[PDB]
Every structure is written in structure tokens, then in C-alpha cells.
Amino acid sequence: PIRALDEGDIALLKTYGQSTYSRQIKQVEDDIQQLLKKINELTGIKESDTGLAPPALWDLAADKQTLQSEQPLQVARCTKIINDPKYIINVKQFAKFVVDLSDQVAPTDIEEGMRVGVDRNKYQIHIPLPPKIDPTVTMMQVEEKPDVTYSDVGGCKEQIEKLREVVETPLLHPERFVNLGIEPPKGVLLFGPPGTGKTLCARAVANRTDACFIRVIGSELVQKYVGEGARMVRELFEMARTKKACLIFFDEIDAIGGARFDGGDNEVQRTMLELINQLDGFDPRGNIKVLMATNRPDTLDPALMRPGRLDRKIEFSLPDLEGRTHIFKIHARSMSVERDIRFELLARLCPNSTGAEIRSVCTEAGMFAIRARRKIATEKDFLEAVNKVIKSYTPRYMTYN
Amino acid sequence: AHHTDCTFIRVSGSELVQKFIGEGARMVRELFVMAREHAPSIIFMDEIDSIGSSRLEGGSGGDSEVQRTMLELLNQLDGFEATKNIKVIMATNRIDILDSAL
Amino acid sequence: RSEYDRGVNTFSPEGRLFQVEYAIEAIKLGSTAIGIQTSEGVCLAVEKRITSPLMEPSSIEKIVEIDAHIGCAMSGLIKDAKTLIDKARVETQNHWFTYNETMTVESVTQAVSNLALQFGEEDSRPFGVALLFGGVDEKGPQLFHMDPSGTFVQCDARAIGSASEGAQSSLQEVYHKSMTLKEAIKSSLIILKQVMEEKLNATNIELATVQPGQNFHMFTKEELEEVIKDI
Amino acid sequence: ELSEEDKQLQDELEMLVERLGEKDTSLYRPALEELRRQIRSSTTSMTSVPKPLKFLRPHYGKLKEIYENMAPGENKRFAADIISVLAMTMSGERECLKYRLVGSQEELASWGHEYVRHLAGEVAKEWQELDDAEKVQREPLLTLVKEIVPYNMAHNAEHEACDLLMEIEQVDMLEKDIDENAYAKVCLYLTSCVNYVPEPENSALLRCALGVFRKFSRFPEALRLALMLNDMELVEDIFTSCKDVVVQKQMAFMLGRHGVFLELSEDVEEYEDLTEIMSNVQLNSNFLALARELDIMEPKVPDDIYKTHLENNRFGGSGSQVDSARMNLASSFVNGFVNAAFGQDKLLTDDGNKWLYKNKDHGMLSAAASLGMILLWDVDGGLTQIDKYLYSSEDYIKSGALLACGIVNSGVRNECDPALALLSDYVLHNSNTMRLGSIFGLGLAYAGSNREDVLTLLLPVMGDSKSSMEVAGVTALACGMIAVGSCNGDVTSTILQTIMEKSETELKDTYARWLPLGLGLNHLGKGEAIEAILAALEVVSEPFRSFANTLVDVCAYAGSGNVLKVQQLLHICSEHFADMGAHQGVAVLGIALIAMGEEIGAEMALRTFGHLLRYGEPTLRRAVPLALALISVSNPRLNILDTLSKFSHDADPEVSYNSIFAMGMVGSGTNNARLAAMLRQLAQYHAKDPNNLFMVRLAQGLTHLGKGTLTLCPYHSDRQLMSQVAVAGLLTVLVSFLDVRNIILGKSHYVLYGLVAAMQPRMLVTFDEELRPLPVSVRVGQAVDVVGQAGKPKTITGFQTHTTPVLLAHGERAELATEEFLPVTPILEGFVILRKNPNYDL
Amino acid sequence: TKGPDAASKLPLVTPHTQCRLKLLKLERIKDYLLMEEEFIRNQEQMKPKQEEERSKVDDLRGTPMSVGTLEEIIDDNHAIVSTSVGSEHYVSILSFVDKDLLEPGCSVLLNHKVHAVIGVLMDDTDPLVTVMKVEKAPQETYADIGGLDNQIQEIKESVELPLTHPEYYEEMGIKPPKGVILYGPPGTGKTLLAKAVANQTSATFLRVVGSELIQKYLGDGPKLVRELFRVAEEHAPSIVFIDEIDAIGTKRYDSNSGGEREIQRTMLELLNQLDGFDSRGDVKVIMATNRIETLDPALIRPGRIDRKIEFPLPDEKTKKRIFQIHTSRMTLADDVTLDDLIMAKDDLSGADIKAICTEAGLMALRERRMKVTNEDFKKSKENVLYKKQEGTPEGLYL
């Protein structure tokens, strides 16, 4: 029995009511939106910054002189030298050319396998170039020590000692191992529950690594083009070999080191196979201690987990009571806490909680102390934080006693 | 679609599934962007049972990808950005199988 | 472990039975109980862990009279603890009946372990409760600790429950062979207050003592305040 | 189509309208009566579309002609009523109103609510269209309003009634039509609408509101609106009209907070107590008690404030051993502002003279001023601790000692007024600097006093041609501060004669920019009496004439929020031509001044200032940060701080100076950790340029002023009670600051102390009727409304139960969470008298 | 530095109801808008050196200018730039290019003919990421949420308070929670609390769907996540909102599919950015999921998501607050006693306590009434509550 609306009904509904100010307000809103759009269009620039130096820095009219005189040179590698000598040059992907040197360079300068520049017209070799240093692989280095030391890692004395015996002791004091004929393990696989502190130990090692520390970004190794990830792994391991006693950290190794299956991952599997032979196989790896971490060790290919590539498998178990107390002290060193805080009770109230949950509890206690305007967080704040962080995420406890 | 005087974009059951991961979400986003550009518009999703079924857990059993497309559609219809002048008509038997988010 | 820990009848690669350890973990969820054995006698202090003021404090049983000369402290599952305590009482009464003598604390602990041992020997699950047996016998004051696995060993001062690790560590520091009952009780109360979430008072702890000559004496409301006054 | 009843009704109505064809006796009366009944029943129902009205699309032209021809009495009126009700939906505006005007009167309510609303709109439109040429049509509209207003009052339509009454420029009807249950709604609506509606209607609206509260005997709010209009006789009348002692005390305390000191009469009960409270002598004790409660009584060291330990000491142990005059002045300003108002310091009270000796001329003057700047609100103790430097070995230190004495007394008034006695024999003192110090001491101690003795003594100072130009500017600033926002006739004439007598050769100097400052300060907040001022100023030759005109015009409308005047200022800024740039600088400062009145104005002025900063010229860009600082004084808005940080590194130096000063002013007393980190980073970055580092330390001092317990906002009581003395001091500082090198960084470093005239605390200490500290659970949060026009006091949100005393940030409002007491004043700011609730029983 | 690019928003009008005070407020805002328009329109017109330098630079640069990747820096006036087609060119670095920004991996701007480097592209942000940035802040503020107070307080302490009042956290010594997860039944107020935070927040707000982070190509997913977080870091104070996290945050499991293993890789890149080697910076992540039991434990562990805010179905007080919020605009009648519908059994969510409002309005329109009545609300509830089929047991329990 419902009846549809007509034109007169619509008109009366939109008129029979409030019309003394509704029309004016609606028009004002529409025109305010229009004015905002007009202003945005009028400015609508946000001039994007470009690398233009200060006016005095360049102030050069000879830049045109160098542009007109100097000529761009394609970079290519001389695969072979022919004997007037002729040179076979691979212009990356363009084509293969058989060119001869320009008078500027001497024949002795150009050697087989060296990447040299060539003119865009005749392809003559004009100048040698330093061997390629990959930009992503080079940026994969640390060159900035994180500010987390071994004193910030608590409850893992045995694990930390094993990690040092793997990545630090063999580098600092090779004599203790050479005298007894002991080859120190070259790799460590830090596997444990998430938030237990593997990455913290890795950061501590990088902090006191006193060598080349390379953090392997799982994103770069997985590349869009086929064969690019294996090339990146091969470049990273070469850059590690050129240095002395390098340290490679394969964070979240389960990102690429999945179990092979029969297209599936395929390309990532090829990159994994490239890392496997680099770590172990022909052509000994050298002084490159590999550090791998993963919260899910069961998905790794058995080849990558075999004790020839990851020699020492450190298990980062949930901290025991002493470990939890030490973690609480470490994370509460800066907190303005009262002097009677029984950290033992807070440790015993977090039965199975990693270091990350302990830090969360400490931050929650601080936030509770901030809620009520108190600058000192009493033990009651810590108890409430423990309830909120662990217990939050009676009849069941009734049976127990 | 006859008496509409308005763009009446149509989406069948399996048109948003797609093989390559992320193609369903991209297709849904392009569909909604085009509908907004041609606003007002009505999107008809016949046989929404295909994509939009009750959400299943992860693991080999779960379809996952269709789940991602359905999540994209859910955000589009009611998310951070509220659609203006875009009405969706979805017809599907078995009303009880559709997840309690669509 | 997920495939080997679904029964006391399965052996883990280590050879561990991954169901008794779960029983120990379950006993780890009970209220802390402390027992100190001294030449003068044996003292048992525990945590009430009262959940609601409406509940009768005497309804929840942590220290019970297994016999007039042996006291038992519970920490863990209520049902297993009650069954084991009743079996201990029955065994003590049977020994008195047949042999006209008070069964030694070692004998009662053995009897209770026997029932704690039939955890699937074809005449269920391990009894998820640890009992601290304290009493005086022909050998003098004694304290015996039992775990769901059935292993029982004499302990001078054992702490069991939620705060087992810290309580035991502090007991090692605060225990000596020449302690008297008063100092032992004071130390036990101090330790319990140290490892107690709520401020210690007369409504959250029940203290039990068993000295030679006298019987199992559980401190009453008035008595407990007298001891907590100084600590 | 239509339903059975629908078509039946439509056919019946068509037949009824058709029966109006010829003129038989028994057709018009029955047809008209039935049409009236149907229309009334339809409209006097729910908002449903009035089916009789929808079906009614005949033509009344024949009906209108018969209406005019026959029965000019009842039948004509009935036809007019029917046609007017019909036109309520259609567009017959003039005819829609006229048919009701000439039709049967009956009553508006008998027809329908929507009809009454439409009639109110029609009346407003006609009144707007009806000018003063003919009053013949005026009376009928007044008669219609006479009944329209009560209908809205009775049916919860206060908004519509207020809109109609203030739309026809006639508001007095509220004086009698208001009801007890609706005084709050009308008062809140008019208070909200006062700011956004211009003059002279603004003045009439404010006066009518005052009348409403006076009729309802709402004394605090009536006084609030009297301050609104700045009508002193209104304040005196309200003071007379009080019979209640507790309300008396609360109003006296509030008026002391405003800074307007009215002469008290011994006849009033508790004259001594009320005068002492309104002279906020005990405010020092209350602030010290709050500091003790917060356990922050320990003085902070400038070394700690700069956090030199944390900064990357690239030059360790060799780059900080040079104590120049400028960095000494910066450190003095820091160990002042920061430790200010606590009445104590571990480096200034004990090592004042040795540190002072290291400065030269202006620097030592500023150090001596900061000497007393340490102890604000402690009159006797401050004077005792500063007399030793007042007797300093160097006679030049005496001016700084006088400045410090005035700053100590700043914000506190003593009945015997030591400052005037101290300066009586020194105002004529030949050396310029000591007289300057005495005058500034008088200004800080006697900020806003408006005591005729001080102005009369300054008149010889104005006529003292022997005084130097800087002394002349200081005297003008002091005379303006004495009569801030008063339009002092004697001072007006004095400044008028001085500025006309001024010479162009001695006017081209940069120090001649304070005379318009004083003119505006005297005429600050009163824009109805400056046209003659501009006419007189037209005599002076350009370009200084343009700057003086612009500054006087801006200060005439300080806070009035006039869109047209801001438009003229924007025009002035938009045209590109020093003094010509002074025009644009004062224009930008005026944009900020007028925009600060309302939240919407300030928020939009932020965008306008950013736009003119990214488009403007060097003078506009220089004036931008000062305008932003003035708009958001002691309101550390994150967007404003971000823009100031973005422009703090600008290649133009003066832009950097102004940006750093704006950072310091905006975060006055906020103790913003982000702002503090930004200031520290800027100080590290500008470690080479002495001036940038000096004013970065200055900004740090302003931000840490009172250790987060002092606020320089020129507004109060929910950020609406503008502070006349505070605003005047702010304009003086800003005008002295548009040119920093010559004044701020030149020979007049002591000008920045003028802003201390705006110093005020922010706190939530609660007392009892005896005035003893009475702790009470108080909820704290931002006053953000969650409803429409229900007239709610902002529906305090972000509740945080706190025990008084508590700290309320800018725009932060806390309410008396305990119904045990009812405040004498509805607001909850500063100290309040918690009146025990008699209605509630424990 | 590149400080926050906070979204622009006009001030709020309080009256809401179409009273003349709202008209005055809107007129004032429009006046200031016309003010700005006139000022900026006169500036260029009223406007009447560096032109020589600009002309010289642009004539040396020429057009069009190719955007390429800098591979290495050989000398101070020579570098190897690889054009977009993968071909490396040994081009000459011109004087007018700040050598400080020239670093390997940067997007260099090259002359089209000689390929000589002429400028360094600064932003070069992935277009699929620059879209995420919130420019127009949503109009839904905090007053537009009924209840969810505890939740509002937690979200404010996580994403809002730290910027405004960092003093408290600095003195207490605790780093403010930098990650919050919003989980709960559907239609509870998760995306709303996100919209309100974006409206009030002064930091750059980035919105993602959890499905746009997945790209068809292999390495595009992790690289897109890295680009998003790099853009968030570029604007120091930022809030990143990943709604529908359960799209890519499903529990990691051995998947015999590159699709699944690619999605897992995207999740791993996300969790590496959130809390891994190198600090995350001052970027706060807000995530919403109507399913938190299916998320990878690593993603929702403390350190990445520090406050697992729960969003329950509204209770009686919250339901009354959502009726007041969604009926304030509506012209209710005198007999509308909302408590009758507010009672409910247990299962009325905001969406419903709003669709119910919309349905009541529509049913009022059906009877030609713009003022709703109690019967309209009851019918609307009966019509719009038909969501769950049974969701209940039988008459077993007593």
C-alpha cells in the first residue's frame, strides 16, 4: 500500500518547512567549496625542488662549453681482445660490437673484462672505467652503528655467548681457534618466538662488529626481472669477499628461503639456490660470517638449514625468571620508577612473555603513571600494566589454587 | 538499468577474481574510481556469492585472493573515503553465506 | 612436540614424557606455598589468593590435616589435590589400623605417590598438583615434596606454586640447619610477603606448624596477626 | 497518481474553488469556510505535505478581483487568509505577506508552525526591503513580531525568535518577552553571535543582552558584556547593583583578573578584603603554594635550560668561553623568564651585581631589569631584594633597577603605590636612561591603572623637549599603557599635539614608530572614535603619514573582527611600493589583531598569512611571524609552530629573527617538548650567528616562562575575556619588533620588557568561602560542543578527574565535578570560590 | 627535514542547526576565502635579476628532460647514469647541480640529447604511494563518535598526545606507543576512530587498504611497502593507517603458491619496516581488522602493535550515545522514546544504530512526514536488523 512520491509532494517537502535560512546556508556552503577549489587551482603548484645549487656555486658560462665539447659515452665491457688490435665490447643490452680504441687511450690500458666507455656513433673505446660497484648492494651496508649494545640484551647470556663465538670471537682472536685446530662456525640462525630479541642481538653485533656489517634487505633480493635476485645475491657475496672479515645479516630469511616445491615462487627459489651455493659448495665462501634470523624456522629449505651454511642454530627461547627480571631492569633503567618496585613479582606475573611484551608492559606502566598526573610510576601501575598487556590479551582460575 | 538516467556499471560474479595477485583489488579500485568519475553511478554485482562469501582462515584451504578483492570492495563501499553518489545493488542467493562485513 | 605430547603413552625424541611436564606447569599456576623444616619442627606458609570477599576463607583448602602429625600443602589443581589428600588420609588411617602406629611422613608420601604413579599404567592423566608434606615422626621433623610425576624427595625448605623460583632462591639464602620454629616462621612470612602481589595481612595467608609433642597447629586469625606484626 | 481519498479530496476542492465563480449569497461564505477548515486541519497536523495545499493550484485572480470589489470586510479577510496560506508554499513573497497583513488577523498559531516560520522569514525580508522613508508599513510588522516572538519562546524556537528580533535591528522586545527557563539559551546565543555580527548593530546587540541579564539579574554576565562594550559607567552601575557579599568577592576577583581596577568605596562591606583580593597581593602566595604542590619550586639554570650537555659540542671547552654582551643579555632573559614568578633563583638573587657588571649600557640595563623579573607578584620581598641594586655603584644600573622593581610589582597593586613615590623625583631626571627605567617601572607595576596623577606627571614629560627620542617613545608607551583601551581625552590631546608638532626631519628616524603605538594604546579597542584621528593625521606628510594612518586604523579596531577593515589592510599589503614597508608590516599586524577575535577568524587568517608569506615581499615576510605570534599568543598550535619552524631557516636574517620570536611567544609557558627540541636544534644550528642564537635563547625563555605555569594570552574566561593591558603591551612589543636590529638588537633591548604588562598565570586552585585552599575533584578537558544550539557550555570532553589545583592549557576547560559546590562565576579558571551546595544533602 | 604535510581543513561551524549564527559563521569563512582569492589574484596582476640565471639554466637544460637513475659518481664532474631503458651512459655533471644530493640510487634529471646531468629529482615518489596521502581531512571528528571513550583515550595516547605533549613521555622515560591495532565486530567504530584521528591530527596521514600494498609483479609489493614507509618518514610526524590488515596479515604458513609466498613476503617487509634493523622513526601505524585471531603473531606482537584496542558491540550507554549522535540532525517527534529500541537483545552495532536512523527517516518520507515518530523507528528496526540468521542455541540451558 506504500505510495510513490510525486513532483508536487517533493516540492512541498523541500519548501514546506525551513526556507528562511536553509537556501542561504546551502548556497554559502556550495560557494565556499567553489572558492576553496578556485584558490587551490590558482596556487596549485607546490614547486617541486630540483638539485639547483646556490647561484654563486655554479655561475658558469663554460658549462655550455663542456656540454658542447664533451660527449656522452656508453659504458660497455670488453669481453675479448683481438690481435691493429680489435676489441669485442658488450654494450650492456644494446648489442655486441667489435671496436678499436681511440687515439686518446693506449692499448695497454684496456684489458679483457674491463668496462670501458664508447662513443654513441662509432662505438670506439675512449676511456676506461672503474669496475661496477652496485648501488643497491653498496647501500645494503650499515656504515652507521645502531645504538643498542649487548648490555641492552638480557636473559640470553648463553645465546649471546654463542653468537659472539660465531661472529665476533673468530674475527677478533683467530689464535684461540687456530691453535687448537678449530674452524669456527661461519653462520648463525637465530630462530625463536617473535619479539624475543634476535634482531636486538643482531643490532648489538653490528654495533660492536668492528668489521663490515651488511644488512640484507629481503625486498631487494626479490627483484621483478628473472635472474635479478640471484645477481644481487652474487654481487653482495662478491662485495663481502672484497672486504676483510665481513658480516652478512639475512634478516627474515623465511622471506626468500622457502621450501622448494614443484610455477610457484620459482624466481625466489632460484635466488635461494644462488645463496645456497655461495654459502657452501665449490669456491669456498671465505671470511663471511652469515647471520640469519627467522621466527618460523620450519618453512626453510633443508639445504639452507643444513649445518654447513648455518653452522650454529641458536634458539631464542622465552626468558626464564632471571631473564625476565634482567629484561625488566634493562627496560626500566630510564623509567622514573619508585624504589620499592618488586621486579621479581612482575617477572613472575608474566609467565610466558618475550622481551617485547616486557617492554610493552613497561611502556603501559609509564602511560598509566602519565594518565593520573604522577611523575613516578608506582608498583600498582606496573601491576595494572601487566593485567592490561598479558592477562587482558576468573571461573577458569577458580579450579586452580 | 532501463529507467536509470545514470551510469549502471555491471560486475559479474567472477569478473573481479582474476589470476595474478592484486589484479582483483586493482580492478575493484578502477571500477569505483570510474564510477565516481561518471557519478552518479550504480554498480550491480550479480552473483556476489562468488566474491564476498563468508571469510575463511588462511592455509591451503582458504581462497585468500578473492578475500583480498572482497576486502577492497568493503573498504571502497564503507572506508576512510566515503563514496558520493555511488549506489551498489548486489543480488545473490544464499544470503546466509555472505560474510558479516559485506 | 605437537605430535608426541598428546598422551602420557608417547615418548619424545629426548625420551621425555611431554605430559608430566605439562602437569608441572599446571602446578605452576597455583598459589605459592612454602615449607621450612627445622630441628624444632616444620612450618608451612602459603598464599590465600582470595578471589572475592564473599567466599568463605576456610572454604578454600591449602593446608590440610592428612593426619594429626603430618600436614599437607596444596599447589595446583583442586580436584587432584583433594583426591590425593583423601588418599593420604586413608593410607594413614589404614597404616594406623593394621600396624597400630603412626605412618612416617616418608611412608605417607610413598602411599600418595603410588596413586600419583598410576598415571596410565592400566590399573587417565597425571595428577596436576604438588603436595608439601610436613610433620614429625620417629625420625624427627620432616618435609617432603611431591610433583605430578610421582617423584618425591626430602626437602629442608621447599617452595612450590606460582613463586617457586624466587621463593626457593630466597629460601636458600635465608635457611640454615640451626633455625628455630619462630625464626623459621618469620623468615617464611618475610619471603611470602616478598613474593606476594598483595600486601601481606591476616586474610591472605594461612600458616601451619607441626612440632614434636604437639600436633598440627594451624595459626588462627588472632595468631597470624601476632606473627605478621613484627615482619 | 492519487488514491481514492486523494481523488475524492481533489475533486471536492476543485468544486469548492469553482463555486467561487458567480456571487450567490450562499457560496462565498460556505466555500470560504470549508476551504479554511480544510487548510487549517491539514496544516495544523504533522509536517505531512498539506494535501489541501498541494491540490490547490487554481488561480485567485478572479478571486482577488472579487475580494477587492465585494465585501471588503469578513469575506475579503477570509479570501486573503486562504490565499496567504496557499502562497506560504508558492513564491508570492510580497503578496504572501500582504494577504495575511490585510486578511483576517485571527492568530498565526491557529494556522501552523511552518506557516509561522515562513511568516517570520517574510517579515524579516520585508523589513530589510522597507527603508525609513515610510513608517506607515512599519507598525504592522512590529505587531506581527509581537506575537511571532512568544510562539517561538513557547515552542522551543529561541533561535528563530532571536534571529527575527536581531534581523530587524530591533532587539528590545527580549527585555520583556524572555522567560526564566529560556534566559540561558538566549544569553548564550547572543553571546556567540556578538563577535560575528558587525557594528553598530554589534553595540545595540550587546546593550540589549546587558539589558536581558539585568532584567534577569545576571550580574556576572551583565558585567561581562559591560566589559564587552568597555562602558565604565556600566561597570560602576553593576557594582552598585550587587547586594550579595559572595558574588561581590567573586566579581571583584574577576575584575582584578581583567586588570581593570575600579576605585572601591569604604561603604561597601569588606572593602579592605575586596580591595586586597582585586589587587592580587596574595596571588604570590597562591602561586607559591601551587608550585610547592607540583614540587617544581627548585630554580632552573640557563645552562640546564639550554641542555648544553645534550647538544653536540663540536667545539668542546673552547667555543663557550666567550661571554659577549648579546649572549649575556640572552642568558639574563632566560634566567629571568624561565625562573620568573617563583620569587627565587640560584644565580640572579645572589650573583646579580657581578653578572650585571659584565654588560654594557643596554645589556646591563636589561640584566638589572631581569633582576626583579625573577620575582613577579612578590612586592615587598622583590623591593627588598632589588633595593641593593637600586643603590648600585654605577648610576646607570639605576634604570635597570627601576625596571626590575616595576616588573616585580607588575600584576600586583599596592594601596600605597611605591612606584609613583620612587619615580616622582626621578621622572624629570636629566639622564635619559634612569628616567626611562623609572617610567618602565611605573608602567609594569601600574599597568592599566589609569591613575590621573601618573598621566598629569607624564604631561610635563611629554613637554620635556630635553628628553631624548628613546625617552619620548618610552613616555608615549607608558602614557598609552596607563590608559589602555580608554581613549583618554587629556592623553588624546597631548599625543595629538605632540604628533602634529612633530617634524619630518626628526620623524624619518626609526624610533618615531611608537607614537602611533601610544595613540592606539589609548584608543585601543574603540574603533568608533578614530575617523577624526585619521583626519588630523592626514596633515603629516608621507610616507610616515601612511604608516601612522594604517597603525591608528588597526589599533582602532583591535579585536573588533571587521571583515571590511581586514580587506583594506589586505589591499595595503598587496601593493608593493622601509616606511612604505612599514605600512605593509602594520597592515599584517592589524590583520592578525582583528582576526584574533574569533576562532574562525584566526584559523582563516592562518591560511591568509601563509599565502602572503609564500607570495609576499621581504617586508610582508618579516611581518608575518609577528602576526602569527600575535594571533596565537600562548596557544602553541602545532600548525603555527610547524610553519614558524619551516621559515626559521630562511636565508633572510630578519625573517629568522621574527620566526624565532614568534616561536617563543606562541609557546609562552607551554613547556612543549617538541617546541623545546626545535628551539634547541635551532640554537645549535645558529651557534655561529650571535643574534639568531641570542633570540633562540629568548624564545626558550618565553616558552619556559613560569616553568609552564604562566600564560600571556590576551584573553580569559574561556579565551574570550580580552586583557586590555595585556593586548596593549602585546601591540607595543610587536610594533617595536617589526624592526629588530635597531630596537630589539639595537640600543633598545629593554623594549621587550613591555610584553610583561600582559603576564598572567594559568591554574585551577580551588578555595572555600573563607578563601582557604579547598581541594576538590575537578574534571579537565577541551570545551568542544557535541550538540547543536542546545546552549550547552561546550560539553567538556576528554574528562580527566584531577584534584585542584590543576593546570589548564590554552582553551583547556575544567568543571566543578563535585555538585557539593556552586561557583559564584560559571567559568572555572584561576581561583574560584566553591560555594557549598545547599540543595544537595551529603 | 621535510616537515609534516598535514591535510588542509576549514574550521568547524558549531550551530549545525540552520540558525542565523551558522549563516554568520559561514559568511565569515566565505569572506576570508574571498579575501585570500582577491589577495592572490592581485599579487601577480599587481606585480610588475634572477631572470637571466633562470633563462641560462633552462636554455642549458633544454626540454624534454629525461629522468634516469644515477649508478655511480666517478669524478666531481662525471657520473654514470643508467637511462630508463637500462642502458648506462657516462654523462657529464654540469655545475648547476648540488653535488651533496647526488648519491647512488637517486633519480637524476638528464639532458635529452647529450644526457649530461642537469638536476636531481627530489620527490620521485611512486605514484601509487602519493595517492595514499590524505589531503582533504574527513569531516568526522571525535564528537561524531558515541562512546568508545576508553578506545578514544588509548588512540589519543598512541597517535595524538605524543605529538602535542611529548613532555610527559620524555620525563617518564617511556617511548610513546607507536603502534595500535583496532579489532572488533564489523560496524563498531574502527574506521571512524581512524577518520577522527586523521581529522584532528596535525601529522601527515597515510591511508592504505591492505589490498593495494599487493602488486601483481613479484618485487613490487615489498618495494611499495618500503616506498610508503619512506614517504611516511620523510614527513617526520606521520600516522599510517592500514585498514583491512587481515588482507595481507594472515598467519604465515608453508604455501605451495607464489601468490601466497608473495603475500607473505609483503607481510614480512611490512613487519621488518615496523620493528626491525634500523629504528622506525616517528611513524605511527594504525591497523583495523574484524578478525585478529587470523593475524600473524609477529605482526601484532608488542613493539609493532603496542595497544590492541578492542572495539566491542555497543552497550546500552554507548547505544544511547550513537542514537543521540545520529539523530541530532533529524527532527524527532515528542513520542520518540529511543530506549525501546536501545534495549535490544545484545547485537545492535553503530552501522545499525544509523541505518535504523536512515530507515526511520525514509519511512517518515513515505508517510510524507519530515518528523519521525516511534512507529517509524520500530518499523525501521524490524526492517534493518535482519542480519544474522540464527546465531543462537536451542532451549537447552536453563
Ligand SMILES: Nc1ncnc2c1ncn2[C@@H]1O[C@H](COP(=O)(O)OP(=O)(O)OP(=O)(O)O)[C@@H](O)[C@H]1O
Ligand atoms: N631479550 C630482550 N631483552 C631486552 N629487550 C628485548 C629483548 N627482546 C626484545 N626486546 C625489545 O623488543 C624490541 C624488539 O624485539 P626484536 O625485534 O629483537 O624481536 P625479534 O625476536 O627479533 O622479532 P621477530 O622474531 O619478529 O623478527 C627490541 O628492540 C627490545 O627493545
Ligand SMILES: Nc1ncnc2c1ncn2[C@@H]1O[C@H](COP(=O)(O)OP(=O)(O)OP(=O)(O)O)[C@@H](O)[C@H]1O
Ligand atoms: N560508535 C559509533 N559512533 C558513531 N557512529 C558510529 C559508531 N559505529 C559506527 N558508526 C557509524 O557507522 C559507520 C560504520 O562504522 P565504521 O566505519 O567505524 O565501521 P568499522 O568498524 O570500520 O567496520 P568494518 O569492519 O565494516 O570496516 C561509521 O562510519 C559511522 O557513521
Ligand SMILES: [Mg+2]
Ligand atoms: Mg626481527
Ligand SMILES: [Mg+2]
Ligand atoms: Mg573499517
